[PDB]
Subunit: 445 residues, 4 copies
C-alpha cells in the first residue's frame, strides 16, 4: 500500500451526517427512481457527485465572509480580489463573474463570431468545437494532440479558427494534466496562424502540481512560478473558481494584456449579463472567500496532501485488482463499470449499476460517466453507446478524511466481490429529450 | 409633520464608516471623473445607488448562512426555500435562480418566440402600457393594453408582465383591481400573465394602505390574492426578500408542462435545478428573508421611512416625484437646476453635489443615464430629469434619513450659484452612464 | 430641542423584536411578579437594564470571532489582545480575564491584605471600603473629594490604607466623569503616603471624551492621548471590558510597571482562578472581539455620536419638564421617580412604580436605583430608605437609534401625564435575605 | 490490528497550520525555555495539551452562535440551555456557569463548611478513595470510603464526589454499579452525593461497551440512570459537550432549598443567574453541544479514535497507561527513559522529543508537574512518570493519529541515545510546571 499525506490543517467546524442502514439506503435509491441526482444530500454519507463548489473553506475565508462589502459599485471586497488575481497570474486585468459558465458567456463571444470554430484538448463536450485530444496511445495524458490541431488550423482556414482553448487539467480524460511543454507547443501554433489562446483554468492548481511533480526540470521550481509561467503562453483565461480556489461560488476571467481591447468589451458584456463589473453577479461575501481562497488553493503543502489523497486511493485500488483510469487525475477516480459488470451491456447502463450499488453499500454518491450520461441520439433518438463506462468519484477539497477514503475503496471492493450476482442492469422509465441523465427515472430488470 | 416609525428591531452588528472631509470628498470625486460609479464604496457615507442586494439581514438569516447545505443535488437549503415559496405564494412550483435577470432568461424563452410582451413599465420586443402619470400610479393602462393586443393581434402577444412595485415609475404601486382587470384580459385572449415581483411586499403594503376595503386584510392574504391572478412570476430576490443574492421563478399550476422547460433551461443556463446558481448560504438566507420581508410590522416601518423623507422634502418645498414610491425618492433635478439644460445633465450635478455635501451616493435617472441616439450619437433629451435615492432595507436610521433631507435642502439653497453642468470627456458606445468620464465647464 | 449625532456607521445585521400590545405587556409584568428581572428578553422592546456586555460589535469584530484561536497555551488570539492593551494604555503588562469582577479578584488581594482599607470615589457599594465621593455641593461631578481622602489617609494610618481606586466614569453618581485634574490630585496623595493607585476603567473611553469636551485645555487634544495620560497617574487598572470596548464578554488587568512584582503574582493568581494566563477564562472568539473592540471604543467619531445620544435624550427631557441627574452621564439617564410620584413613599418603591410603568407604556425595561434596590438592613431587617429614587436607563452601545430614544423620552412623558392616577406603590410578596431586588416578587396595593 | 472508525461527519471549515522544519522547531522550543507551555500555538501541529475547550463545533452550533441572545436577564439562549439540561439529565434545576471551577465555587460552599469531601480521584479538605489500579478503574473504593466516613465520623464528611470519567486515573470509566453502591452509602449516612460530570458521555459509552447488560441500553437511558443516583452534579462543559466555554450545575430535586443558595451564590460570584458569566453565543453553542456530545454514532467514533491509537502503541510495544481512557493516552515516560531519573523529568524529555519529532505538543504528568515540597523545596519524586496526549473532539483525523503513533515509536527507538534529562533554571514558588524555565545537562 501507500501512505496517506496528513492534512496540513486541523478541523475547526464539522457538518454532522445522519448514518443510514443499508435497508434504509435501499429505500432511498428506490424512492429516487435509481437516479442518484434525486437523492437528498441529507441521505448521502460521502457525496462525491462533484468537486465543484462543495469544498470546505478556512477560518480565514469565513473571516472575510463576515467582512464582505456588499456595495453595488466599488466594494472594497472587489479590489482585494483583483489584487490577488493580478498577483498570482501577473495578468493585467481580472474580472469577477458568478459561475465558471458565466465567464465564457462574457468573454468567448467577443472573439468567437458565430460561424468560427475553436479547437480544444477535450474528449466530450456540450458545445461548433473541434476536439483534438492527444490519443492516450502513461504520463501527462490529456495533452492537446499538437499535430492534429496544427493540421486542423489548415483544413479549416487559419483566419477562421476563432480560438484555441486548453483546459487544465483536462476534465474529460479524468483530471489528467498538461505539460509545460504541451502548453508552449500549443501556444506556438497560436501565434503563427494568429489564433487567440484561452486557458480554461478550473483546476489550474492541481495542474501546476502535476507539472512540478512530473514534468522534467520543474522538480525544484516554485509552484507560484509554475502557475505564472503557464499564464504566459496564453492570451487569456476563463475559470470556474468553485474548483481549485477552494470556494463555494464564483468564476474569473483574466486577460494578460493590460491594454487589450477585450477589456472595455468584457466590462460592457459583464454589465449586461451579470451586473456592474465590480461585483459581477458575485456577493461581497463570495468575493472575500475567493480572494483569500485563491492562495489557499496554491499552497504547496495543500497541493501535496491533495495529490496524496488521490495516490492513496489509487494505490489501494491497484492492490484490490479494480480497474480505473490508470494515471489517476487531480481530483478523483473513474471506476471502469463495464469491467466489473461484463453481464450488463452498455444500454443497461453499467455505470448506474455501480453507482446505485455503491450507494447501497456505504451511502457513497457517484454518477455514471458512461452510456447513461451520454444520452440518446439528438436525431435518431436511439440510445448512444459510450466509449467507456465509468462511474466518477469527484472529491471536494479539504472535506473528507483518510477514513472516508477507506470507506470509498472498501465499498468498491465489496461490490466487486458480489458483482456476479446483479444479472441485469437498469431500464429507463421516463426521460426528457434533453440533459437526460440529470432527470430520468430508472428501474431494475 | 410626519414622525418616523421606530425600527421593529435592534442593531446587532455594525459596519463602521470612515467620515470624510468635505475637502477630502471633492478630491475623491474629481479623482473618480465626476461619475458616482467610480467612487470606492469606502468613501461613501449614505450609499443609495440601489436597494438591490445591499440590504442588512437578520441574525436569524445569518444563522441560516452558517447552516447552509452546499450539496450539488438535494441540499437541505433548497427544500426550505421551496417550502417558503410554495407557502407565501400558494404556487405549485418555485425554482431558485441566482438573479432576477436569470429568472427572465430562464422563464421567458419558452413563450417569447422572436412576438411581443406588454409591460406596465414606463421606460426601457417590449410594448409599454402603464397609465399616464393620485394613488396606484404603477397601474397598467388596461384599455390601452387591449387596444395593443388587437392592434398586434393576440397571436403576436407572447406574454404580459406586470411589475409590482412599478420601478420605472418610481416605485408607484399597482392596484389589486388593476391586476384582476389585467388577468381577465389575458384569460380572454389566451395570453400568459407573469408578475415581475421584485418589490411585491412594498406593493402589498401599498394596497393595504390605500385600496378600498383592504385596510383590514393581512399582508399574507393580500400577497396570496395578487399572485392568484397570475400564471407565474419572476423576481430578483435582492429587494423585498432582504437578501444580497437571489432570484426566484414561480409557476402557479403544479402540473403545468412549463415546469420541465424551466428545469431544463435552468440545468443548462445556471446549473442543477436544486441550487440554480445559488450557494448553500444564499438559499438559506433567502428562505428566511422571504418571511421577514413581508412582516406587517416591518412593512409599516419601511413605508414610514419613505413617508418621513417625503414629509421633510415637502416642509422645504423640494420637488420630488410624488407620491413617494415604496423604496426611495426621485428628486426633480430639472426643477432644482433650470439654469442647467438637459445635455449638461441636471441629474448628474445634483448627484455630485449630494456627494460633495454629505457623502451621499445617488445616481442620475435623466439625460446622462439615457445616453446618445443609437444611430446619431447626439445626446438624447430625457423626458424627465431626476436623482434617485435608492434605500437599502434595515441599513439606515432616522438620523441618516435626516442627513439626506438636510443635504437636499442645502444643495437646493445654493443651486442658483451653479450655472453650467458637466460634459462627457470619454465615453463607451453603449452603457456610458456607468463608466463614462465627466468634467465641468 | 437638540440635534442628534448621526451614526458614524451603517447597520449590517439586525435582531428582530416581537411587538407587544399594552394589554400583552401588562400580562408579562404581572406574570413576572412586577420584577423587571423576571421578564424575558423576547418580551422587551428597548432593553435598557444594563450597558454591560449588551453592545453591538462591528463586522470587523465578528470577522475576528471566526478567526479566534482556541489554543489553551499561547493562542495567537491572545497576543493581538495584549499588543492593543500595551498600545492604547502604554502599560508594560496586560492580562486577559473573563469578567470585570474577575479582574479585581485576581489583582486587589495581592496588595489588599485582609484588614487594610481602601478609599474610592463612589457613593454606593457592595464591598471594608472608605467612600470619599466629592459632594455634588454642575460639571465634572463624580470626582474624588481629594480633601476628604487626604484626611482619611491620616485618621486611618498611611501604611494601613491598602490602596485608592478611582473608578471612571463614576457609576454610582450616574456616569459622571473625572477631571484630568482630579486624577493628578488623587495621584499626588498616593505617592506621598505611599499608597497604590488603581483605576477601575469600565467606562474609561466615555470618560476621556468628557475630559476632551469639558476639562479646560483638552479641547484640541487627541483622545488617544487623553487616555494614555490618565493611565500615567495610576500604578494599575482593572476593567470590565463589557462596557467601553463595545464587546459582549471580557475583563482586563494592567500594571504600568513592566518589572512590577505584581506581574508574577497576577500570573499565578490568574492560573488559579481563571486558567492559564494566555486566555484567562476567555475564549479565542472573545479575545479577538476584545482586541479589535478596544479601538472601536476609542474612535473619536464614535465618542461624539455616543455623547450626543445622551445630550439628545437630556435636552428632550429638559424640554418636557422631567427630573433627572442634571449633568447627564456617559451611558444614560436616571429619572427621579420620587419627583414624578410624590404619593408613593420610599417603602412603596417609586422606582419600581416608574420602571413597571414605563414597561407597560412601550416595552422599555429599566430598573430601580432606589429604595427597592437598596434592600433591608443586614442586622435590623427593616426596609432601608434611599437618598434618591432613580430608575436607570442604561444604554448598550451602537444598538438603539434616534427613533428608539424618542420611544424612551416619549414613554417617560406619558407616565408623567397620568402619574397622579397611581395612588399606591408596590409591596414585597417574597424576598430572599440577600441580593433582594434581583429576585423578589411584588404586587400592587 | 484495530481499524479507525470513520467520522460521522464531513469537514466544513478548516484551520490551516504552517508546517515547520524539524530544524525550525528546535529553535522554537529552545527559544521557549524547553517548556511546552511557552510555545506559541501557531508553532504547534497536533496540539494535545488539553481536551478542555479546544473542541471543534458543528455548523449547527455556529448558527447557534449567530442567534445568541445577549440579554442581561431572560435571554432566549438561557431557556434553550435550561431545557437541554433538564431533558438530558432529568433534573429539576440546571444552572449555567462559565467554568467547571465556577460550578464548584458556586455549589460546594453551601455544605463544605471549613469538613471533608471524599473523591474517587487519585491525586490533587479532599480525601481520595479510588480503587487500587481490568475494566472500570475509575471506580471509587466503596469499602474504603465507608471506612473513612466512620473514621472521620459522618458529621465531618460534607459531600461525596464521583468524577466520571475519572481523569486522575487517565480517563478510566466508573461502573454504573459503583455509582449505585456509592449512592447507597451516601443515603445511609445522610451525605450529599455530587457527580463531577465533565466526561459523563465518554463514561456513558464505556458503561455501554463493558458493563454487563448495558450493551443494549441507549446512551440517553444510561446517562439518565447514572444521574438518578446522585443529588446534584457540577461540570466543566468544555469537554464532552463539545464547546469551548461553559460550566453547568444541576440539582435533581426541583423543590430543593439548595437552589436559592445556588442562585444567590451565582448572582454574586458570576452575574445574574440567567447568563451566569456566559454570553449569548456560548449558551447557544452549549445547548446544541449537549446533545451532539451524547450521540451514539459520535461516541462510537470517539472511542474508536482511542482504541485505534492504543492498538498502534501495542503493535510497537509502547508502554502506555492501560486500558486507554476515554479522552487521550498517557505514555509511560519512565518506561521509555530509565536512564532518566525522576528529578531530571522523563516526562518532560518525551514531551520535548515529541514536539521535536513531529510538532506534537504534550505535557508532563510526572515529577516536573508536581514540583517541590511545600516546606522543603526539594524535588518530589512523582509516583508515576507519564506524558499526556489530550485529544480535543472532532479536530484530528486518522492521519493525525498516525502522526502521533509514528512519533512515539520513533522517539522510542532513539530514546537510548539520551542519557540525561533537564534541570529547572528559573522557577516560581507555586505552579512552576506551567511557567518554569528548563534546560538540558
Ligand atoms: C424589477 C427588477 N427586476 C430585476 C432587476 C435586476 O436585478 P438582478 O438581476 O437580480 O441583479 C431589477 C434591477 N433594477 C435595478 C434597480 O432598479 C436597475 O435599475 C438593479 O440595478 C429590477 O428592478
Ligand atoms: C473534571 C474537571 N473539572 C473541571 C476542570 C477545570 O476545567 P475549567 O474550570 O472549565 O477550566 C477540569 C480540568 N482539568 C484539566 C485537564 O483535565 C487540568 O488537568 C483542565 O486544564 C476537569 O478535568
Ligand atoms: C462538474 C461540473 N460542474 C459544473 C461545471 C461548470 O462550472 P461552474 O459551475 O463554475 O459554472 C463544470 C465545468 O467546469 C463541471 O465539471
Ligand atoms: C451593571 C453592571 N453589571 C456588572 C458589573 C460588573 O462587571 P462584569 O460584568 O464585567 O463583572 C458592573 C460594574 O462594573 C455593573 O455596573
Ligand atoms: Cl451585492
Ligand atoms: Cl454549491
Ligand atoms: Cl479556550
Ligand atoms: Cl451578555
Amino acid at each position: 500500500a501507500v501512505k496517506y499525506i496528513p492534512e496540513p490543517f486541523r478541523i475547526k467546524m464539522v457538518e454532522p451526517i445522519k448514518m443510514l442502514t443499508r435497508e434504509e439506503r435501499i429505500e432511498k435509491i428506490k424512492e429516487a427512481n435509481y437516479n442518484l441526482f434525486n437523492l437528498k444530500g441529507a441521505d448521502v454519507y460521502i457525496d462525491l457527485l462533484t468537486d465543484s463548489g462543495t469544498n470546505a473553506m478556512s477560518h480565514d475565508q469565513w473571516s472575510g465572509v463576515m467582512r464582505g462589502d456588499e456595495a453595488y459599485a466599488g466594494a472594497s471586497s472587489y479590489f482585494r480580489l483583483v489584487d490577488a488575481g493580478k498577483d498570482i497570474f501577473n495578468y493585467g486585468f481580472i474580472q469577477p463573474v458568478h459561475q465558471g459558465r458565466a465567464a465564457e458567456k462574457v468573454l468567448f463571444p467577443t472573439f468567437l463570431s458565430p460561424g468560427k470554430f475553436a479547437i480544444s484538448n477535450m474528449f466530450f463536450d456540450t458545445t461548433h468545437v473541434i476536439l483534438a485530444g492527444a490519443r492516450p496511445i502513461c504520463k501527462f495524458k490529456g495533452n492537446m494532440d499538437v499535430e492534429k490541431m496544427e493540421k486542423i488550423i489548415l483544413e479549416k482556414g487559419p483566419e477562421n479558427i476563432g480560438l484555441i482553448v486548453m483546459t487544465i487539467t483536462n476534465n474529460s480524460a479524468g483530471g489528467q494534466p498538461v505539460s509545460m511543454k504541451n502548453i508552449r507547443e500549443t501556444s506556438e501554433i497560436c501565434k503563427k496562424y494568429g489564433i487567440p489562446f484561452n486557458i480554461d483554468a478550473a483546476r489550474y492548481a492541481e495542474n501546476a502540481y502535476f507539472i512540478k511533480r512530473d514534468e522534467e526540470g520543474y522538480q525544484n521550481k516554485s509552484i507560484k512560478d509554475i502557475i505564472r509561467e503557464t499564464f504566459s503562453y496564453a492570451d487569456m483565461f476563463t475559470m470556474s473558481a468553485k474548483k481549485d480556489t477552494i470556494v463555494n461560488m464564483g468564476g474569473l476571467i483574466g486577460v494578460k494584456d493590460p491594454q487589450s481591447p477585450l477589456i472595455l468589451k468584457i466590462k460592457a458584456n459583464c454589465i449586461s449579463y451579470e451586473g456592474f463589473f465590480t461585483y459581477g453577479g458575485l456577493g461581497g461575501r463570495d468575493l472575500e472567500a475567493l480572494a483569500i481562497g485563491l492562495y489557499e488553493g496554491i499552497d504547496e503543502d495543500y497541493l501535496k496532501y491533495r495529490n496524496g489523497q488521490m495516490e492513496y486511493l489509487a494505490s489501494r485500488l491497484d492492490d484490490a485488482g479494480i480497474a480505473y483510469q490508470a494515471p489517476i487525475g487531480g481530483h478523483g477516480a473513474f471506476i471502469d463499470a463495464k469491467a466489473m459488470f461484463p453481464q450488463i451491456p452498455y444500454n443497461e447502463y453499467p455505470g448506474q449499476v455501480l453507482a446505485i450499488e455503491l450507494y447501497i453499500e456505504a451511502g457513497i454518491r457517484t454518477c455514471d460517466i458512461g452510456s447513461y450520461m451520454l444520452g440518446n441520439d439528438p436525431d435518431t433518438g436511439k440510445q448512444l453507446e459510450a466509449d467507456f463506462e465509468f462511474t466518477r468519484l469527484a472529491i471536494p477539497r479539504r472535506v473528507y478524511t483518510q477514513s472516508h477514503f477507506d470507506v470509498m475503496a472498501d465499498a468498491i471492493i465489496e461490490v466487486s466481490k458480489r458483482a456476479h450476482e446483479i444479472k441485469r442492469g437498469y431500464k429507463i422509465i421516463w426521460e426528457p429529450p434533453i440533459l437526460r441523465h440529470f432527470q430520468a427515472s430508472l428501474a431494475p430488470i
